Amino acid sequence: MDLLAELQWRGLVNQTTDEDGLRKLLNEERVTLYCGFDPTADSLHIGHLASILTMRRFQQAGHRPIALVGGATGLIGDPSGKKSERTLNAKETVEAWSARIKEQLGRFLDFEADGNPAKIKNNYDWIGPLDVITFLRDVGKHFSVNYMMAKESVQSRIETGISFTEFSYMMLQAYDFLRLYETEGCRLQIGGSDQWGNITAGLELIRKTKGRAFGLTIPLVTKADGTKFGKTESGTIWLDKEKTSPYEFYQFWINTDDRDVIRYLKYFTFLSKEEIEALEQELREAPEKRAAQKTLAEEVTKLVHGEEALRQAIRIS
């Protein structure tokens, strides 16, 4: 209702399986929602913050978030939003990366709350021990090859090429939703823009096994110049302060172009509408002051690294 209207205002809603059905439910019950994160490196990056902070927003509005670490799926690899087949990482690598990722995820959510404390989960726990036969029969029987081929992630790659490995990824993500739906009463899955297919696959599986649940996607973060959000000359802006220092993190945000600053405040910060609006007027009236930029920089650096880290960043600058 107002949560969803707020996300809309912020521009955090790309698509929704059924807006009125979801608004209703959000408004009538404490909803268990989840977001999955695959270890593709030893650290998350700014590419994951939209999803992370959106979970947080959901939690603040009284819902219960489940952060899913892709221990199993990170061993397969999601073709979604990828133009090329990826290289398979080793079990040891993925296993090691999952542990770190788990740590950074925890920073953004509340574990102390009673009623809606978060949960961090690893899909390795239910996918790890699943036998191929069970998988092909219990999950696979539910999907025709024709439904799967039409998926953006696959459609986008058939000429380019895609192994059966990556083609099947959707089944696993599908399965995650079902399992979470069953064991945790999970009724909503959220994710970036590229996850639509995987999410809807999950819904198809629930529907076909149960005959209820929703999916929401966040839009790709845009730049006025048409370049790739987070594509720096320095390389990736990581959430690990040992890869990307708080100073570098801080600088990154401080250098937001005037064109993007207001979309980024809405996306990445917990400033109200009236605060965000006031900054817009300040942006208009005194753009050399860079008030929108400092506010973004401090807000986001505090979120991710904390005040002390922010304090250093400021004094280093």
Add this chain to the structure above:
Amino acid sequence: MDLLAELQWRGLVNQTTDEDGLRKLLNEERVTLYCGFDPTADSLHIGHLASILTMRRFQQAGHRPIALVGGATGLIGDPSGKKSERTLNAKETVEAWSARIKEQLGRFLDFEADGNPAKIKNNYDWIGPLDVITFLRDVGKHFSVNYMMAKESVQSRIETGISFTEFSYMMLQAYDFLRLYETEGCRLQIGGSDQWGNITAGLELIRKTKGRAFGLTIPLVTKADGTKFGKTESGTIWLDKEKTSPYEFYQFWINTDDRDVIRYLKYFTFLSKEEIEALEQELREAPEKRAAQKTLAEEVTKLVHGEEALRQAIRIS
């Protein structure tokens, strides 16, 4: 060389991955070959005899045959030669059927021979305990969706529809060949006409994992009238004497149309070329005698049920 030339003469060769390469090898070494049989009922039927007897021919020429009971794959189901998606049978059902099938297979092969005694195997043993992750990575990475879609069995069904379950079957059969190649030095796989794709899939996997082996298919048994071989008014002609009695079995063969009799003698019997030719001349000169038909009937009933069974069939008639 002569084995292969003989099969050719008989019309037991539909296709071959590389005839000269296979002829060479057959002629230079004791070849380990295999044929897989999926429990789709509690008994084999006359639809499986071409493959079975061909194994036997291979064994008689000094090669070692491996009869594979599809304990695992029989739980997935092969779309090959099927116009429609099949219903999944239960583990208990399949398990029970595998045991029977194992029994009928054993009748046709030699276990006493030293140098080339047969082996009966069950793919449940290596597929049963395989985890989905291992499967998607170790087997799946080797196949593009584009290679698999072009397969006759899939191509033939995309509009009609095919689940991911049946679509993946080829991977399992693929895997069987690899495993048998590795543990038993299996260099040749044989099967009916509809297995070409599954066989070649196996070869693709070996090639891609090892960088040697061959595939041979038997043609669909034809009728001059253009009807379906084995399609009786009575229903299936089973190899279990409790489903189809030796008398009924015997009768079935005795009623072979003059048009087919000679193709069936070549296919299903161990009569020489000169014996088969002589019967052709007898067929020409005295077709009301039905000498070709009696010979077929006795030869095949003896093979499958034995002399005593044949003796009863004859006296019952």
